[PDB]
């Protein structure tokens, strides 16, 4: 991922969504788009985005339905033109099969989330977020989301999945992440507030990315 | 609702899911519909189906995402017309108070979802499904979802919960859960494919309802 920075694209307004990802495009080569966005303008946002930007889209919907919606879910996104969907682990083994199954047909990436970065993560979803990375890897998932809010938890993911998988992570700027830190265990880290409500958004990503070369 | 009986609508084109809403409106007043039909048609169609058939609708969407963004999506979902927003609580209190705020500003409803229907759901929801239910009744959530699939844990949903609460319940029928049973202690059950992808979905609603009706 360039510069290992991937842009959370949580406007709601496809004039803003695509003025500050247009101000940042020189900094990054991915943008995750989420449901605060598609909903608002639809799932055409997305080609629209990738044909104008050329940048790669993580579907950032971390799918937690039963096995036959998740699928339903995966071909719409894929069908869209994302290159990634993001998938929470939580509901288990066959929920997760699913999604792989569709990206395998369709050539496309899942990007499993293990551990969320927010503080309600720590009531039921930490305690499992170990054996929900052992299940990716007996699954052949090579992409995963793990929490930035907690560098020990990242490296015990990191651990887990090994070096050879591709490991991105949240929750960096707003939430209370560092990316240097971040980095010492992710791939790449995902910014969304930090940058795309700052009176500069170039600046901000500049800024980041100024102090990630440096590691 | 209407017989108790939700219709999940999660057929992906726009004309087959009008057709067979339309021909089971006289069985149902309330329908659940999801990503995969506001993923491929967008989001206007509920406000299209709210208009046309003048039924209540549950958007399924199963939020699991920071408060923040829960926020976000709960804010585009009643804007577009959704009366209730289903909500998973295995992310934790805050995710789902995001929630919460958001149908409390705009008048709408949440629907906790605590233990899912699919085998999967054995892995890690299902363990902390009654922590998930009880955390709901602290928050002051009214309205639950809770597996046909499994009764025995419907019932246990239903004693946390106790009988002053809402509690809808889908696995009837494709994923092996009975009506008559799931009635036993939830208010009303969701159904799809049993019913959408029927040769003669208002006869299939018919049959569910004749069951019903014998309880």
Redesign the interface.
Known sequence: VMNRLILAM?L?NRDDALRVTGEVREYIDTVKI???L???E??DIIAEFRKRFGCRIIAA??V??????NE??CR??FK?GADAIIV?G???????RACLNVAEEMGREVFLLTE??????????QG?AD??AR?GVDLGVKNYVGPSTRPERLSRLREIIGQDSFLISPGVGA?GGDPGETLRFADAIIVG?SIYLADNPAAAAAGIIESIKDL
């Open positions: 949580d709601m989420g449901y605060p598609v909903l608002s639809g799932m919907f971390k937690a339905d039963i096995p036959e919606t339903k879910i719409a996104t869209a929470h939580f509901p288990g083994a066959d929920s997760v969320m970065s927010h503080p309600g993560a720590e009531m039921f979803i499992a054996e929900i299940m939430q507030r």
